[PDB]
């Protein structure tokens, strides 16, 4: 068993728990019981940002980016209710935990894309009739993506939503109709999509693991500009408890 002093500064603290190759079993789901997820963990390994196309109007592609905010990207200790609904399908309802991480990635050209990698208020369901969580079980649902900055955040000129100025004080007699998008701050709240694909199951412990893929929007700088389409891939780990 490893301790904190064995892990500190190594980067393993940002790594989700894994299961060995011999964990391809199945965890039975009994409709008579109540189930929960005691620990959900999401570790991103790749960040894709959709290029904003020229004017070609043909399919826009997701380009690879480079992480510059280091090993601070993993979600963990996410717990929630695992309900067995009428048609046998399972559904996870996210409740609490470290369900968000601010992440900044850099695109080719030098452009930096800050984003709030999150799964807040996630409601992910499975196909009907899931007697057991197998290595082919998929979880698909939606989550809420709140603003990157909260309401108290102040820009370099002291403007903000719940605080700060409401104009460009450095330009006392400038027409404010042009700077309206920069003077008036807006709090964003968009929806995200994610698919959790199970590949490993330990039926004795209730531990599952696999890969996930989420699609969300990046930072809009409190309405200052248009966000980007971001795709996040990686692995996940979850433990089921009755």
């Amino acid at each position: 068993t490893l301790t904190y002093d064995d892990i500190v500064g190594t980067g393993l603290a940002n790594k989700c728990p894994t299961l060995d190759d011999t964990a391809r079993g199945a965890y039975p789901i009994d409709s008579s019981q109540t189930y929960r997820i005691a620990r959900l963990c999401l570790q991103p390994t790749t960040f894709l940002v959709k290029e904003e196309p020229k004017n070609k109007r043909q399919e826009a592609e997701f380009v690879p980016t480079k992480l510059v905010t280091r090993e601070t990207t993993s979600l963990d200790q996410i717990q929630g209710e695992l309900k067995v609904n009428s048609d046998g399908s399972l559904t996870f309802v996210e409740e609490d935990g470290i369900d968000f991480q601010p992440v900044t990635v850099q695109m080719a050209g030098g452009e930096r894309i800050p984003l709030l990698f999150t799964v807040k208020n996630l409601v992910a369901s499975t196909q009907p009739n899931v007697t057991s969580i197998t290595t082919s079980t998929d979880f698909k649902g939606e989550f809420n993506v709140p603003s990157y900055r909260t309401a108290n955040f102040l820009d370099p000129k002291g403007r903000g939503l719940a605080s700060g100025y409401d104009s460009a004080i450095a330009l006392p007699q400038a027409k404010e109709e042009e700077l309206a998008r920069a003077n008036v701050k807006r709090f964003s709240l968009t929806k995200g999509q994610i698919s959790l694909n199970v590949a490993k199951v330990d039926g004795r412990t209730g531990e599952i693991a696999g890969t996930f893929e989420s699609e969300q929007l990046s930072d809009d700088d409190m309405g200052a500009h248009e966000p980007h389409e971001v795709k996040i891939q990686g692995v996940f780990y979850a433990s089921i408890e009755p």
């Binding site: 020229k54 004017n55 070609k56 109007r57």
Partner: protein
Amino acid sequence: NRRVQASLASGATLEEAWSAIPEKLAFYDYIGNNPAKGGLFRTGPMNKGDGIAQAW
């Protein structure tokens, strides 16, 4: 025109044939990219003249 006629021969509509033409190819067929249309004291890039090409 050869690429369009070949498309019409394969059984494509007029809207389909011209849509199969690459924007990069049509852009070459524009006198604004002709190097013999400038001026001695018309300085800078070509985008300073006709502008930055956005779409066909």
